[PDB]
Amino acid sequence: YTRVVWCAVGPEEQKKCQQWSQQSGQNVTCATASTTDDCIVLVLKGEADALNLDGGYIYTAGKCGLVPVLAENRKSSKHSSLDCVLRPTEGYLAVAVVKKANEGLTWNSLKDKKSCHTAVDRTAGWNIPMGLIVNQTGSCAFDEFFSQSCAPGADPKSRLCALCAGDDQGLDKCVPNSKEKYYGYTGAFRCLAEDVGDVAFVKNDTVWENTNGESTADWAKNLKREDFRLLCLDGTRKPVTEAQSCHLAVAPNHAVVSRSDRAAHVEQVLLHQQALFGKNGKNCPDKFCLFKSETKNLLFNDNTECLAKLGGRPTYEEYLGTEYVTAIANLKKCS
């Protein structure tokens, strides 16, 4: 009765989930929704068990009583003696990325430029940059700051969706799932790369994984890191190798959430699913890799090395951290 129902956001995640479902012998099966918020509702109704969320979505889910269960953990250096499953998580760097050739764009000259955001309510793509901008401007009018944006999940007719491209048919403009061409870390970095926007709010790892041949994908295969700079909060611009001194925040890793009443079962099932399909899994690369989707970050980030146990059975507030939680609260006072 530890069949776990995974919630897949949009059709491409649904398709990966189906392949996992098949390979797991139906130990995992799939519910699908059009948006992460709808997936959280399925979970609240007990029609789905679990999904992996960005931190801004953990805030939504945790306000509704869902709880973190295991965290994404990626490649490390300190704690290298520890198994991935037991290693604490280190968070990721939220950065603002621009074209090196867009000279004299700084953090301080962002007003009226064109932005690319991973999705509204996400950590690096939205709560951190807009939280900081609202704070620095003294103004809740975050929808008037950038001239045009792609911020998937905003009103499709608003300027915050103007740059979004929708799917290969032009349908679904600005839907917050991977059907939207500019959705997600990779979508928003693509919106910069193709110069639809002036600035992408993604994380440090995005830049590296879609540059210098790390991605074979047609829009990314020719990008060189040297053509990009980070915007530091002090007004300077740095190379993308300096993200440790040039970021907007350290974000809590993406984590699996579930209803509390199902958390222990979801954990057990996932720990065994990743022994089969995770990074050195018995059946990956052979049959299925849970943490691969050709750079589209479907269900989990493709840079995930394992899902790791959480120290201290944290509540969603403890997992997010008090400072991040309050930053999210404060920003939400605007809208």
């Binding site: 918020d37 959280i40 509702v41 939504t60 306000k63 509704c64 009583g65 609260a329």
Partner: peptide
């Protein structure tokens, strides 16, 4: 300040 958005 507090309560589920659904």
């Amino acid at each position: 300040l507090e309560a589920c958005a659904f």
